[PDB]
Structure formats: C-alpha cells, structure tokens
Enzyme design. Structure first.
Site, PDB file in Angstrom:
ATOM      1  N   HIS B  41       0.488  -1.507   0.235  1.00  0.00           N
ATOM      2  CA  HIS B  41       0.257  -0.050   0.032  1.00  0.00           C
ATOM      3  C   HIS B  41       0.144   1.085  -0.193  1.00  0.00           C
ATOM      4  O   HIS B  41       0.009   2.354  -0.181  1.00  0.00           O
ATOM      5  CB  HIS B  41      -0.972  -0.243   0.920  1.00  0.00           C
ATOM      6  N   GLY B 143       2.390   6.394  10.320  1.00  0.00           N
ATOM      7  CA  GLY B 143       4.425   6.177   9.289  1.00  0.00           C
ATOM      8  C   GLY B 143       4.978   4.695   9.742  1.00  0.00           C
ATOM      9  O   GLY B 143       5.560   4.567   9.536  1.00  0.00           O
ATOM     10  N   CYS B 145       3.626   1.777   8.883  1.00  0.00           N
ATOM     11  CA  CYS B 145       3.444   0.361   8.095  1.00  0.00           C
ATOM     12  C   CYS B 145       4.354  -0.298   7.690  1.00  0.00           C
ATOM     13  O   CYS B 145       5.929   1.467   7.491  1.00  0.00           O
ATOM     14  CB  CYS B 145       2.514   0.608   6.877  1.00  0.00           C
TER      15      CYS B 145
HETATM   16  C1  LIG Z   1      -7.402   2.859   6.568  1.00  0.00           C
HETATM   17  O1  LIG Z   1      -6.123   2.634   6.043  1.00  0.00           O
HETATM   18  C2  LIG Z   1      -5.456   1.287   5.523  1.00  0.00           C
HETATM   19  C3  LIG Z   1      -6.223  -0.211   4.932  1.00  0.00           C
HETATM   20  C4  LIG Z   1      -5.849  -0.830   4.877  1.00  0.00           C
HETATM   21  C5  LIG Z   1      -4.783  -0.802   4.295  1.00  0.00           C
HETATM   22  C6  LIG Z   1      -3.860   0.118   4.672  1.00  0.00           C
HETATM   23  C7  LIG Z   1      -4.247   1.084   5.662  1.00  0.00           C
HETATM   24  O2  LIG Z   1      -3.617   2.126   6.110  1.00  0.00           O
HETATM   25  C8  LIG Z   1      -2.649   1.977   7.080  1.00  0.00           C
HETATM   26  C9  LIG Z   1      -2.759   3.289   7.358  1.00  0.00           C
HETATM   27  N1  LIG Z   1      -1.125   4.407   7.858  1.00  0.00           N
HETATM   28  C10 LIG Z   1      -0.711   5.009   6.641  1.00  0.00           C
HETATM   29  C11 LIG Z   1      -0.612   3.779   9.064  1.00  0.00           C
HETATM   30  O3  LIG Z   1       0.728   4.027   9.110  1.00  0.00           O
HETATM   31  C12 LIG Z   1      -1.588   3.538   9.763  1.00  0.00           C
HETATM   32  C13 LIG Z   1      -1.327   2.204  10.702  1.00  0.00           C
HETATM   33  C14 LIG Z   1      -1.630   2.155  12.073  1.00  0.00           C
HETATM   34  O4  LIG Z   1      -1.216   0.967  12.122  1.00  0.00           O
HETATM   35  N2  LIG Z   1      -2.479   3.064  12.966  1.00  0.00           N
HETATM   36  C15 LIG Z   1      -3.007   4.429  12.570  1.00  0.00           C
HETATM   37  C16 LIG Z   1      -3.044   4.911  13.167  1.00  0.00           C
HETATM   38  C17 LIG Z   1      -3.737   6.657  12.398  1.00  0.00           C
HETATM   39  C18 LIG Z   1      -3.127   7.012  11.281  1.00  0.00           C
HETATM   40  C19 LIG Z   1      -2.684   6.009  10.559  1.00  0.00           C
HETATM   41  C20 LIG Z   1      -2.551   4.478  10.854  1.00  0.00           C
END
Ligand SMILES: COc1ccccc1OCCN(C)C(=O)c1cc(=O)[nH]c2ccccc12
Ligand SMILES: COc1ccccc1OCCN(C)C(=O)c1cc(=O)[nH]c2ccccc12
Lengths: 304, 304
Positions: B41, B143, B145
């Site tokens: 992603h 950030g 991931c």
């Molecule tokens: C709805 O999001 C997704 C769904 C499926 C696939 C990927 C998606 O993105 C991941 C979102 N990202 C990029 C993060 O780094 C993230 C990871 C996390 O565990 N908590 C978060 C809390 C607050 C903001 C962001 C996050």
C-alpha cells in the site's frame, strides 16, 4: 492507536555489552570508549558477600585478573579503579560501537529501559519505572549483574542504571554509572529495608490521558476536585502527593485532550475510591504508574 | 526473580530498517541481503485506499519511483515485484548488517517482539501475542506500516510479521514476510470483521507457573480437575479449549514446580469463577495470556 509498555530500541546498548570475569565470578560490563564499567562485586566470592571489604579484595587483583570479552574477542586491561560501587577497567581499545552517550542519575518516578544480559549477551529488553523508594521491579536472574538501564534521545544514550542485586523481597537495586546506589542500599548480602513505596500519581494521570487518547473513556466523570482534596485521597491510597509541578508537566496532555488536570484528578479520585468495577483501562485491571507524561506524548506522537 | 513482558533485543532488526517512499507516501521497509520488503500500500494515495487495484497501481511505477533510504544513504532500486500484499524491491547493495534470518508464519497464540518504526527509524520495542483471531493489539501510529514482528533464536532472526493496518476497532492487522495476511483481512479501507477472540489458555497456565516460580502462590488450591471439566469452564469464559498437546507443552513447567497441569487448571478454574478478589498475580489484576510456555522457561532460565 494502541498503548504498550514500550522499551527503547536496544541496539545501541547491545553494542556496548561485554562479559567480565574475575576469578570464578562472571557478570556483565558496559564498554564505552576505552573503559569497561561493571559492578565491583565481580571481585567477591560466596565467602565474601556477607560483609565484603572491597578495598582489600581489590588490592589482591591485578589488571590481568579481569577477563573482559566482547563476544568472541578478548580486551586487554591496562588499568582498574573502583568508583563507589563500580569498577572501571581501562582497556587498550576504544569500543568501535560506542554510541553518543551520557551518564545521568534519574529521579524516582522516571522510567527507563533495561537490557537484561547474561555472560555479556543481551537476552531481553523491558521498560521499568524507578520506584519512589529507589527500587526497580525487574526481571533478573544469576549472571544479570552489570545489565544497564537507559533512555535514548534520538542518537544519544543516557545510561541511568547498572544492576547490582536482588533484595530478599525479590525487588531490585542498583546504581547510577558513577556507582552510587539508588536508595539506601549497599552491595552486601544483608537484609535491607526498602522504604515504604508509593504509586507515582503523575504517571497514573499521564496514563489516564493516554487511555482517553486511545478511546478508553468510561472512567471520565462529571466531577472536578482541588489539589488539596485530591491529596487527601492520594494520602489514603498511598499515592504521591500531586504538586503544581506535576500539573504543569501534564499541561501538554491536558491541552491535547481538552480535559483539565483537576478534572482528570477527579476521575482518578473516583477510581481510587470505587475501583474499576471489573472493567479495564488500556488492557489493565489496575492503575498503571510506569508511564511518564513524556512517555505518553512520545508514544502518542511517534518519536524516533 | 521477577517477571516482565520482555521483548527480544532489537539491534539485529534495527540494522535492517529503511524508509520507502513512493510518490507522496512514506513507510518502513525491511532490507535483508539485496531485497527491501515493504507493504504494497506504499503505492496508494488517499483516493485509492477505499478499493485499490494494486496490479494497476504498480504498473504505473518504475524502479526509480521507489525511494529507499537507509538512514543517510540512498539505495539504488534495480527491480520491483509484488508478492501477495508485499512489495520486494531489489537493490544493488546487500545490507552489510543483514543478520542470519528466516521468514516464518507464526501460529495464533504465539508471541513476538515488534520494533515500531517511523520513516525508517526505530522508535520502540514491545512484546505481542498473535491473537487467536489473527489480530495483534499493538501500538502503531501513521507511518508505522512496514514495522516488523520477530523472534530471535541465538543469532537467527525469525521474522513473522509486517504491519499493514489498523482496523476501525483499533486493533492491528498485517502479514507474514511473504505478504499473506494473518486472518481474513485485506489491505483496503473497509470495515472488516475480526473474528470472535478468545483467551490463550495455555499461555495463562504458563504465566501461572511463572507466578509460582517467582513466589506469587496465593491462587494455588486443594483442587484438581479434568480436561473435560476444565473445558466446560473455558467455554463459559471464552478461553481456548485445552488439549493434550497444550498439556504436553506445559510439561517442563509442571516438572519444574511439581504442580501437575490439571491441578494448575483447577487453580485457573477457581480464578475464572471467582475472580482475583482484588489481589494481583505478577503485578497484574487480570489473567495474562501473552507469555507462551517457551517464554516463561526462557525468562526463568536466562536464554541469550
Ligand atoms: C485505513 O487504512 C488502511 C487500510 C488498509 C490498508 C492500509 C491502510 O492504511 C494504513 C494506515 N497508515 C498508512 C498508517 O501508517 C497507520 C497504521 C496504523 O496501524 N495505525 C494508524 C493510525 C492512524 C493513522 C495511520 C495509521
Ligand atoms: C545477595 O546477593 C548480593 C548482595 C549484594 C550485592 C550483590 C549480590 O549478589 C547479586 C547476586 N547475583 C550475582 C546475581 O546475578 C543475581 C542478581 C539478581 O538480581 N537476581 C538473582 C537471583 C538469583 C541468583 C542471583 C541473582
């Protein structure tokens, strides 16, 4: 989101761990630049530990009696000296993995990570609080002495603790990196009173703020309190009295959540008086005091 | 003595973390030999994440669109491919800090350490269990991931998890290092049911054995039970049914303490039916299930 008892990444400290053997005793040492620091009780035998005369025991030792091994390789010891309860072994080679570092004496109520080690080899890492009574509740077995506690600010490791002993009560005591014990403890096998401990109030409040940030909000109530009223309850429940300095340190978390510090104190007052009623906060069924307000903000912001 | 939620030392994994940027999205990658692994992603935008066509999104990308930076230095990308939900970026330089490693798919109920990272920089380390429903209760922000989960057996790092997402419920989902999600999850911003979770019975029993070893014994009783009787109680309290395979894995702890597994099951049965009555076990006011029997023995023996 989510909130875990997180330790600092231990890599910078793993690169400093060595094994120190003197006679039949082996423990861990910390190799920074051309000095290896370790507990002075590496020079004791079982006979000695009930009342060791460290000055006399050290006089029987020469540089060549201190065997220092950094994994596979042997370090050449060119000097030795005792500073309080630590030995400083000067070696002929500076540690190529020495990180930027400082030696700090932490305050009771502050937190740090411990890298538990055996025979100079790191085994695990966990986060601690220095209790108000200057003990730590660690996880240490035979051979763990010389394991260190530390905090990391970007690239700088602040070493704050070196492990020395387990009290008969199962709690742990140690020194700063100048070899001064935290608390009233001495490095001898004797019964030693750890003072009355208290719960670190400012950390419990910081953790309630972490709970609100992460969605656990059931404990918020319609009440407020004062520092005086809250401190009567803190006294009854063996919590540290809250001061304006603690309120000021909680300022950023209060601003972030919009919950005034004294309103959070009223939630804590109700939790102390009523308990959790079988509910949990951030996966805990008790009031957690091992996260400082700085820890909560670091964890909730993303500090690397 | 003492028992802590201990993570593996993170040094070997810190040396593998890199930052991967594709367009405007930045996350973490794992650099092992001449390959960088990261969540696919990284190729999405906000527009894309509700229903991304990963094959089409990746076709618009070339090697030079994947910016990979190992701290200060830039890696040259000479190939890219998608394997399940991970991207594999072939780079022209093998990571000089590549530890001995394996990719493993862990079983639900097993534990591992997570090195939380942001922009390729490690921020903290904590110990997790893979829940029976294949989620983890982590601590992850924007950030994070590409942060990985792992276990260490002496010098070998077994990578078992790469972080991909946070479900709307605040729990975490990710993949093995071949990019296969644990559980039914997909990498899209949609509501996704995590199954009914259960408590990891064999781990609670392992932790009760750790409690007895470390001196917390109040919960031991005069009773015994059978697997059948205990499993009726486990069903009522949403605990995993205990099997003979679980009893066999608890064999070493039963031998160490002299407490037969079914006698420990009777202590657990009474704790489930009566609660803790305001008491604690190893500093916890709930029944802890994030320590496997291997974790308890490792922690109680001193494995480096
Ligand atoms: C709805 O999001 C997704 C769904 C499926 C696939 C990927 C998606 O993105 C991941 C979102 N990202 C990029 C993060 O780094 C993230 C990871 C996390 O565990 N908590 C978060 C809390 C607050 C903001 C962001 C996050
Ligand atoms: C009574 O002991 C001391 C008293 C004062 C100064 C030093 C003493 O020795 C320390 C004992 N050593 C060497 C250990 O490695 C140790 C440390 C520990 O925290 N827990 C243990 C549990 C079981 C067996 C040993 C330990």
């Amino acid at each position: 989101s989510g909130f875990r008892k997180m330790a600092f990444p231990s890599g910078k400290v793993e690169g400093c761990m060595v094994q120190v053997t003197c006679g039949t005793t082996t423990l861990n040492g910390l190799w920074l630049d051309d000095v290896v620091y370790c507990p002075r009780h590496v020079i004791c035998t079982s006979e000695d530990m009930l009342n060791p005369n460290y000055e006399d025991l050290l006089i029987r030792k020469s540089n060549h009696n201190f065997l220092v091994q950094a994994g596979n390789v042997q370090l050449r010891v060119i000097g030795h000296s005792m500073q309080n309860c630590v030995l400083k072994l000067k070696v002929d080679t500076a540690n190529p993995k020495t990180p930027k570092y400082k030696f700090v004496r932490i305050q009771p109520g502050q937190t740090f990570s411990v890298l538990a080690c055996y025979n100079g080899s790191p085994s695990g890492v966990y986060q601690c609080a220095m209790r108000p009574n200057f003990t730590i509740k660690g996880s240490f077995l035979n051979g763990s002495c010389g394991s260190v506690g530390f905090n990391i600010d970007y690239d700088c490791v602040s070493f704050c603790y070196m492990h020395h002993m387990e009290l008969p009560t199962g709690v742990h005591a140690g020194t700063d990196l100048e070899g001064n014990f935290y608390g009233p403890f001495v490095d001898r096998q004797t019964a030693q009173a750890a003072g009355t401990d208290t719960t670190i109030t400012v950390n419990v409040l910081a953790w309630l703020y972490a709970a609100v940030i992460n969605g656990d909000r059931w404990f918020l109530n319609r009440f407020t309190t004062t520092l005086n009223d809250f401190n009567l309850v803190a006294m009854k429940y063996n919590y540290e009295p809250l001061t304006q300095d603690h309120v000021d340190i909680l300022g950023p978390l209060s601003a972030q959540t919009g919950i005034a510090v004294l309103d959070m104190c009223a939630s804590l007052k109700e939790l102390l008086q009523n308990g959790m009623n079988g509910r949990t906060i951030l996966g805990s069924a008790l009031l957690e005091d091992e996260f400082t307000p700085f820890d909560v903000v670091r964890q909730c912001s993303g500090v690397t």
